[PDB]
Amino acid sequence: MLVAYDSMTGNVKRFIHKLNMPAVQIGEDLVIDEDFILITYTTGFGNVPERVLEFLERNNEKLKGVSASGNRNWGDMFGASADKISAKYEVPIVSKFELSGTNNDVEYFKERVREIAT
Numbered sequence: 001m002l003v004a005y006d007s008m009t010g011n012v013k014r015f016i017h018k019l020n021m022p023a024v025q026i027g028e029d030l031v032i033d034e035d036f037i038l039i040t041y042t043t044g045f046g047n048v049p050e051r052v053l054e055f056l057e058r059n060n061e062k063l064k065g066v067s068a069s070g071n072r073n074w075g076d077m078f079g080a081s082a083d084k085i086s087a088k089y090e091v092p093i094v095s096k097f098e099l100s101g102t103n104n105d106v107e108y109f110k111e112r113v114r115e116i117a118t
């Protein structure tokens with residue numbers, strides 16, 4: 001499955017490169033015409049980044065699941081971008097991981113996406 005992602009300081013980008021799955025960085029101009037999983041980071045106080053919000057305003061039809069990178073210092077706001085997107089668009093939260101993730105976070109994401117893709 002295609003992974004769409006956004007990264008501001010490189011942590012989600014690093015995670016993407018550990019997955020070895022088809023992936024595309026989201027942009028203002030991007031239209032995704034096939035099923036995809038979104039990986040986002042969390043910004044502000046528990047929020048979805050603006051670039052991800054504007055992309056999802058336009059591309060949510062094919063969204064099948066969302067993961068968030070985040071930081072457990074944020075307590076109940078940890079990965080809350082994924083909670084928001086999941087609730088709004090009624091798609092599963094695939095996973096939450098800290099920063100660029102661990103090897104287990106990588107395998108877990110892949111195994112959960114293989115499930116959702118069936």
Ligand SMILES: Cc1cc2nc3c(=O)[nH]c(=O)nc-3n(C[C@H](O)[C@H](O)[C@H](O)COP(=O)(O)O)c2cc1C
Pocket residue numbers: 006007008009010011012013041042043044045046047069070071072074077078079080098099100
């Ligand atoms: C200003 C700021 C606010 C943040 N807010 C949250 C947050 O609410 N929840 C969370 O889990 N992580 C939060 N984070 C942690 C980032 O999501 C985390 O560093 C993420 O790995 C950044 O991804 P990126 O390097 O791909 O941009 C915040 C980080 C910054 C700098």
Ligand SMILES: C[As](C)(=O)[O-]
Pocket residue numbers: 023024025
């Ligand atoms: C988003 As890419 C072209 O570094 O896999």
Ligand SMILES: [Zn+2]
Pocket residue numbers: 017
């Ligand atoms: Zn690359």
Ligand SMILES: [Zn+2]
Pocket residue numbers: 050054
């Ligand atoms: Zn806007």
Ligand SMILES: [Zn+2]
Pocket residue numbers: 054057
């Ligand atoms: Zn707008």
